[PDB]
Design a protein around this ligand. Structure first.
Ligand SMILES: [Cl-]
Length: 400
């Protein structure tokens, strides 16, 4: 039987053009002043269906509601929210449906306030952000790749990362060389700042790093030139370091990560970044983690959107030439990757999660942007064991 689908704007809407000219808040669209702004609302349908669209809206305005090339002229004329019919659409294939809103005329300060998109008489199942955090839902589903290590003890992991131009999106974390106790990667933080970030969690479970007993704090051993060192909390706690570095889309950067137990019940974590634009290795930091006795475990990568406002945009990254160096000093090319997704994907509130193979013997991750092909949890991907073995001037690195 056809059914009603109520899509909340706060979890499913985005300002997609002229971002200062409207806003998505906990009640949906507000502060809607600029006729050039576009608001887009996304929800997924499993099968072809018609739908009778309405908005739950208030205002004194004329707006334009669009599904592809089909537009509707819609007046708002209310001081309180009411159901405002728009018109009918024909969804010809499964996938994400995008509904756009644009202001045309207003009698007062703004074009109105839009709380919900309502689709009546819809056949089949749908997926979107409901009964779920609007913050996490709009951030969208992070995705990860885990690389299989050889037998024995690995000390170093090496990975190459390239963010293609089409995958370069502000407020993304492109995490290249993760491990059992932390992360090492690069961020696109603002128009003027990008960071190479390296973080290690304390073994002490707390949200406040100042709660950690002295003997369980992450300890700084080495600090690279121009690197900022601090602590973090609110996601567990530990030590962090970053270098401001203007990395470029389309360039291939290298991440080299050493994890070595000291035999005295600690483990050290040392992160190096190859600044391809300068043709030189940079030290980020070396940190000691107490109460830890491990070699390298769980080499992995991830792709994350950390801004809810950016959830309507995709981001994408390529990972190539993965190598492990054993504690005995032997390099091995890694070939086997396992794809996973985060809890937002698991909740099925966002379906725009993907990863796999490129056509040039790399792996990729892609999420956000409301695409239609997903990849399931645990999918395995493989690359051929080809690629240039790292040639590292070990001694030079030790002197950074
Ligand atoms: Cl920068």
């Amino acid at each position: 039987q056809p059914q009603q689908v109520v899509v909340g704007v706060s979890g499913n809407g985005y300002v997609t053009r002229q971002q200062d000219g409207a806003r998505i808040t906990q009640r949906g669209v507000t502060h809607w002043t600029n006729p050039k702004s576009i608001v887009s609302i996304y929800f997924y349908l499993h099968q072809p269906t018609t739908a009778d669209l309405s908005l739950y809206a208030k205002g004194h305005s004329e707006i334009k509601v669009s599904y592809g090339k089909k537009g509707f002229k819609v007046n708002l004329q209310s001081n309180d929210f009411t159901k405002v019919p728009v018109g009918s659409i024909d969804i010809r294939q499964a996938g994400y449906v995008r509904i756009d809103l644009q202001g045309v005329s207003k009698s007062g300060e703004g074009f109105g306030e839009i709380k919900q998109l309502i689709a009546d008489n819809v056949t089949g199942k749908s997926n979107y952000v409901k009964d779920f955090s609007d913050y996490w839902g709009r951030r969208g589903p992070s995705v990860h790749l885990g690389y299989a290590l050889p037998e024995g003890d690995t000390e170093w992991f090496y990975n190459e990362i390239t963010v293609p131009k089409e995958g370069e999106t502000m407020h993304s974390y492109y995490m290249a060389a993760g491990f059992g106790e932390g992360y090492f990667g690069m961020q696109y933080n603002s128009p003027t700042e990008r960071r190479i970030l390296f973080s290690v969690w304390s073994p002490f479970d707390t949200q406040n790093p100042k709660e950690i007993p002295d003997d369980q704090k992450i300890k700084l051993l080495r600090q690279g030139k121009d690197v900022h060192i601090g602590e973090f909390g609110n996601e567990g706690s530990g030590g962090q370091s970053y270098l401001k570095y203007p990395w470029k889309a389309g360039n291939t950067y290298k991440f080299l990560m050493q994890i070595r137990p000291d035999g005295n019940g600690n483990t050290t974590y040392t992160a190096y970044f190859y600044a391809t634009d300068e043709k030189e290795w940079k030290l980020i930091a070396s940190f000691l983690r107490p109460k830890t006795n491990t070699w390298y475990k769980r080499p992995h990568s991830f792709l994350e959107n950390f801004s809810p406002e950016q959830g309507y945009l995709s981001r994408e990254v390529f990972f190539g030439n993965q190598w492990a160096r054993s504690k005995e000093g032997k390099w091995s090319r890694l070939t086997d990757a396992t794809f996973t997704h985060d809890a937002t994907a698991s909740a099925q509130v966002r379906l725009d999660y993907q990863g796999g193979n490129t056509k040039d013997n790399r792996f990729y991750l892609k999420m956000g942007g409301f695409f239609n092909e997903s990849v399931p949890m645990g999918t395995k991907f493989y690359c051929k064991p080809t690629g240039k073995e790292p040639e590292i001037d070990w001694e030079a690195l030790k002197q950074l």
